[PDB]
Each structure stands twice: as C-alpha cells, then as structure tokens.
Write a protein that binds this ligand. Structure first.
Ligand code: A1IY9
Ligand code: A1IY9
Lengths: 358, 357
C-alpha cells in the first residue's frame, strides 16, 4: 500500500461529514482503513467517492456478536474514528475505557461539533451551527446582507476532519515515546476557532472589525475581492502588496495618478467604482491572458466544470477521473513515499476475512 | 513542554499565512519551534507567533546561512513558505539540508505548487481557490462570489495539509529512518478539502449554479435568517426530523408548507420561514431551541463569543493581551496541551544552539 502512512491500521465507525473525510485522507496516504457500517444500510457498491481507499464491513453493533467482532478489529488497530454524539460509543460498549482494555495502544479519535461535554453537547447540528457560535459565520458575506455559509468547508473539514487528522498523527508521534495510545477530542467549534486564529489576532490589535464586508480579507477591500467581467463571469483580485497592486493597475489601463490611494479606506467607494468599470470592459478570459505569468494577483474564477481545462491544474495532476467525474488527488505530496491514485469504493467484505488478513 | 508533540523540533523560516499557522499549531501541541526572521523587522504583536522562539539572521550572509544550517541539523522539521527556488538559492534547499540531516522533514508550503505554469506567480488565498472551482461556489446566486475570508486556502486547504504532511512523514520516518520533502500546495489541499462537492457533482447531487444547492445557502433549511432585531440565526436542519422539530418551534404547520426538498418551491418555503423567524429576536430563538435537535443557533459576532455558555464552559478561548484567542485544538486526554506562551522577544541563535547541544 503506497504512501507515508503505509502500515497504519484504522477503524472507522461510519458517520457523516468530518469523520469519513478524515478516514479518506488516512486512506489516501497509505493507511489501511476499515469502515464498520450498519447492515440496516447495506445495498450494493457505494457511489460516494468520499468512501474511497476503504474496506467496508457491516455489523449490528447493538448485538453481542457485532460488538465483539468490532472489538477484535479495534484490538488489532492503531486508530479508531467515531463521530456520533457523546455517549453513543460508551452505551455500545465501544467507549474509550472499553477499548483501552483490549488495546492500550489505540488512538481513540472522537469527532464532534460541540465537544464531549457542556450544554450543547447533545444538540444535533451541522457545519453552519458550529461556525455560527464562534463568530465565523457572522464574518462571511456582503455587508448589506445576512451571512452566507462557506459551504461546509470551515466547520466540517478545515476546522473538523483536519484537526482530527492532526490529533491522530500527533498522538501516533506521542505513542513512539510512551508506548501508549490516548483519546483525541476534536470539536468543530474549537478547530474552526484555531482555523481563524488570524482574525482573532488582527482583532486584538485593531486591524479587524466585527462589521461584515468591511475588512481587508472579507471582500471590503477593492483589491481583495471578485469582479464581474463583460461576459458575466468573474475574476479574483488579491493584490495586497503595493507592487502587485501596481502591476494590476498597469494591466487594467488605470494610471495611479487618477485613482485614490490603495489603502485610503475613506475613498474605497471611488476606488471600487473605478476598478469595477475597468474589469467590466473586457471578458474573464481576456483578463486571464493579460495577467498570466504576472504578479498582479488576478485569476479567473472557474466553475467546477471548467477546472479540468486549466493548464496548471492538468499539469500538476491535481485531479484524476473515476466514473464520470473528476476527483482530487491526495494531498499533500511526498518526495520518497508518494501516495498512489485512490482505489474506488470496494464492494463489502466479511469482518472475519479482515481479522484473518490482520 | 506540554502536549503530544513534546520533543519535536521545528525550524520555521518566516513567511505569511499558512507557514506561520502550521508552525503555531505545532507549538500549540508542545513542539519546540524556532522561527528565523530577517533583521529588517521588540515583541511581535501578532498572536499567531505564540509558542515560538524568534531569532533574526540575514540568510543571505555566510554566517546567517551557517547558523541556520546548524539549527536545521539539530531539528526534525523545517517549514518554508517562499516561492519555489528561493530556499535553494539561499543554500537552504532540500538537498543542502539532506547533507546536514537526512532525517529532516522538509515542508514546503505554497499556493500553486513546486512546478507548473503558475508556480512563480504571486498570489493569495482568493487566487488559489479561484482556480479550482471553490470560490465560484460561495455566495448568493444573484451576486458575485464572496471570499470566505482566507479560511479555505491559507488554513483549511493550506496550513492543515502541511501539518498532516509533516506528521504523516514523521510516522513514515519511524519505520524508514529517513526524512523527506512535503509539497503542500493550497490549490491541492483545498481541492481535497472540498472533495464532498466533487463526490456530489459526480452523482448529480451538486450543480455549478451558485446559491442552488443543499449546503451553499440555497436550501431554506441550511441558511441564515434575519430576526426581528436585525441579528441572525443559522438553520442547519437537514435531517427531516430535525426539520420537523424546527417547524413546530416556529409555529408552522407542516401541512401548510411545500415539501422540504421540493427545490422548485424553495423560494416559497424560504418566504414562509423568513416571515416566521422575522417575528422574534435572535435570543428568543436561541432560548426556544436550546436542548433541541432543530439545528437552530444564534449567529454571534466575535465580540459576543466570550458570553456564550457553551464557549465559556469548554474554555475554547483564553484571555491574552488585547483579547481572547483560541485555545489549542484538538484536545488530548493524557498529554494535554497547555495555554499558549505569548510571543517573546528575540533571542540569539547561538543560545538556542547550546540549548540543543
Ligand atoms: C454539512 C453536514 C454536516 O455538518 S456533517 C454532521 C455534523 N455533526 C456531527 O457529526 C457531530 C456529531 N454527531 C452528531 O451530532 C450526530 O451524529 C448527528 C449527525 C447530529 C445526528 O445523528 P443521530 O442520528 O442522532 O445519531 P447519533 O450519533 O446520536 O446516534 C446514532 C447511533 O446509531 C446507532 N449505531 C451506529 N452505528 C451502528 C451500527 N453499526 N449498528 C447499530 N447501531 C448503530 C447507535 O445505537 C446510535 O443510536 P441510538 O442508540 O441513540 O438510537 C452534512 C455532511 C454530510 C452529509 C450530510 O447529509 C447528507 C445526507 C444525504 C446526502 C447528502 C448529505 C450533511
Ligand atoms: C490572505 C493572505 C495570504 O493568502 S498569505 C499566502 C500568500 N501566498 C503564499 O505564501 C504562497 C507562497 N509564497 C509566495 O507566493 C510569495 O512568498 C509571496 C507571498 C507572493 C510574496 O512574494 P515575494 O515577497 O516576492 O517573496 P518570495 O517568496 O518570492 O521570496 C522573498 C525572499 O525574501 C528573502 N528572504 C527570506 N528570508 C530572509 C532572511 N531571513 N534574510 C534575508 N532574506 C530573506 C529570500 O532570499 C527571498 O528573496 P529573493 O532572493 O528571491 O529576492 C495574507 C495573509 C496574511 C497577511 C497578508 O498580507 C500582508 C502583506 C503585507 C503586510 C501585511 C499583510 C496576506
């Protein structure tokens, strides 16, 4: 099995969102990932590409046999991932204390939104709820409108799965000294708060307000925002540093003498009006030619369906095909122990066959 | 040093955005983090530089480089976030570093990657997510896309994939005795970060139309709503039973409403939910739905977060200097991280060297 996590053995109690995204990445990087679903949802070969790099097995964990088979896998594994409400694994007999009795090397990885304790710990939720409570959602979107969710990117994945992964891998490093596993408590409300540490830093020093649409990186700066072009498509401008901004103005045909200063915020209305009219006078792909190879920090805003035609995407193999759709290749990349292309979701397997193999 | 990464040694060449963020999280979890900045630069007021020692050094001088390679020889990980070719010309490239330490994890944090047509282009978060479909998908349908701050390229698809790479490569080192190079590009990371949308598009469950999807704000049951006081709630009631619970708490009879997932009637459903949420203030709904599975939460501004019980009681934040900062994540039962040490003035690079033998 290819990649730097070759050898690593992972048990995943089937959930939704961050739990499987984490499991996928471990898979992506060479880990041996075994997913226990419930047969209650059996079916044929899954069409969810997030379940790549897996072996799937069914097992009614509510039964005595289910529980014991599961506990044999955990016994022989390095990592467990579960993303159910607190108390679910305990009451199933798969809690941390029950796992520590059959394998004190286990990394016990607990993926939730609200955490293991506190008032909201039994409330159902999704990404949008977790980022609503810690200031993040409020900061996303235009100033003249209600906040808009950044898909489920910030809570489920950036602040969720990815902190789970770091916790797992940090704990595997720990286990090299101590010879013991431990419990990783990854809460989306905490992880996403560390994801936005920069804004908490800038806020402390007067450089970020709570006003939506009025900061350097939320769309309030005319030099860090998207612009509509003549064809109704969009470019992104990220020309923060004055040298890059100067390069952008030159490409737009605007002389600096005629514009307000780049960071005179009181005249950002004028500046935006000027840049807006300039970008609107040619089409996205024009701006794409003008600015390729430039430090102007102007890029086309591509839709998913167009990404496969972008030279830089094609050449670094950021994507692969698998069943009428592109999918991202593992990240990050490794010089000596390279990941390989993901294997598609495999038809189910017998939980015994797996214990054998292991 | 408290945390699971006690005894990890990390050298950080100072940059902006992802590299410093990764270095911070490494520090957070108890790594020994030494940050080389350039003298052209007392105490730094960027709290992102917590859990570090800062040293200066002209990496262009002969003596700055020599000192630097003596750190790197003593360390486990090096982090750099410059354009490709830069460390090479300093004589700090992966090959020069492998001579003084073949165990080093050499961690390269870029936006566009190490090679290819855009590899020398300047850029920021908004550019990396523009190229791979992400930015286009964020915002209302009747408007131009809105950047999700720099959360998705710099951090989610950036620093966090550098970390996964640094730590996976440490695992691999345990069985091979050898370091290696980690190439973390924000355009790659952020694509994996959004793998769920690519999965969903492949099965016809996501479109390229902005504002018309389950999770982009087009669903009336996954969106924010303005309340009587001008403040907002978030609704995330995807599962039908959570949805049902929400409708009951709004005073809405499900018989009067279009189906939850009849997309042609979403405009109409949204208008009914909009009127309901508008008839009371945010804190009213916060109360009403506490302990509920309705998936309705108040949308708090940064300055209100210190007053939310769930936040206070889990110590998600600590007070520092100007204000609150996020405590380390994730959390560890046995080897628990400690409260971050503030950014502490420059020390001399030789001091560190004696400290590390
Ligand atoms: C964008 C969006 C997201 O944000 S992702 C999810 C975000 N939240 C979390 O993950 C945080 C922690 N988890 C939970 O808070 C809950 O999981 C729950 C999901 C809220 C509700 O779940 P609920 O149904 O109450 O389940 P529970 O966890 O409390 O307990 C369920 C248990 O089931 C039983 N059993 C588990 N495994 C087995 C087994 N093998 N055999 C037998 N029983 C099993 C346990 O007994 C327990 O049940 P109990 O005893 O209490 O009755 C998001 C992301 C991705 C997808 C998505 O939705 C879509 C759906 C379809 C298509 C597309 C998207 C939404
Ligand atoms: C939201 C936002 C973000 O997205 S942050 C993410 C930005 N993107 C990346 O990080 C990707 C990789 N890096 C780059 O693409 C470039 O680094 C560059 C950032 C374009 C700047 O290009 P440039 O200034 O030309 O620098 P370079 O990398 O090409 O090489 C410069 C080098 O400086 C020299 N030297 C380094 N260390 C030393 C030393 N110790 N002593 C002496 N010299 C040193 C190197 O030798 C090299 O020089 P060369 O030989 O080539 O001349 C974001 C987040 C946070 C902040 C922010 O914006 C601000 C910007 C300014 C002020 C405040 C905020 C933006």
């Amino acid at each position: 099995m290819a990649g730097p996590l070759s050898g690593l053995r992972v048990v995943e109690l089937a959930g939704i969102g961050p739990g499987p995204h984490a499991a996928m990445i471990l898979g992506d990087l060479g880990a041996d990932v075994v997913r226990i679903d419930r047969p209650s949802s059996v079916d044929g070969i899954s069409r969810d590409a997030m379940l790549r790099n897996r072996r799937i097995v069914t097992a009614d964990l509510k039964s005595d046999q289910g529980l014991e088979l599961a506990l044999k896998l955990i016994a022989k594994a390095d990592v467990l991932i579960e993303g159910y409400r607190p108390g679910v694994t305990e009451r199933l007999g798969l809690g941390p204390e029950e796992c520590a009795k059959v394998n004190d090397r286990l990394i016990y990885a607990r993926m939730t939104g609200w955490g293991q304790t506190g008032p909201r710990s039994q409330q159902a939720g999704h990404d949008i709820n977790y980022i609503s409570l810690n200031g993040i959602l409020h900061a996303i979107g235009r100033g003249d409108e209600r906040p808009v969710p950044p898909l489920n990117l910030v809570g489920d994945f950036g602040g969720g799965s990815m902190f789970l992964l770091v916790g797992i891998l940090a704990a595997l490093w720990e286990r090299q000294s101590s010879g013991k596993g431990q419990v990783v408590d990854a809460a989306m409300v905490d992880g996403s708060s560390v994801l936005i540490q920069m804004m908490w830093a800038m806020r402390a020093t007067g450089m970020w307000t709570d006003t939506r649409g009025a900061n350097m990186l939320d769309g309030g700066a005319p030099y860090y925002d998207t612009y509509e072009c003549a064809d109704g498509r969009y470019v992104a401008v990220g020309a923060i540093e004055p040298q890059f901004y100067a390069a952008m103005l030159a490409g737009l045909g605007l002389d600096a003498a005629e514009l307000p200063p780049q960071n005179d915020r009181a005249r950002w209305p004028e500046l935006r009006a000027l840049l807006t009219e300039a970008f609107a006078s040619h089409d996205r792909d024009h701006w794409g030619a003008v600015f390729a190879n430039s430090d102007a920090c102007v890029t086309p805003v591509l839709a998913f369906g167009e990404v496969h035609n972008e030279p830089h995407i094609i050449e670094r193999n950021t994507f692969y095909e698998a069943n009428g759709g592109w999918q991202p290749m593992p990240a990050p990349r490794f010089s000596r122990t390279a990941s390989s292309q993901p294997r598609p979701p495999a038809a189910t397997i017998d939980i015994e066959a797996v214990l054998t193999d292991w």
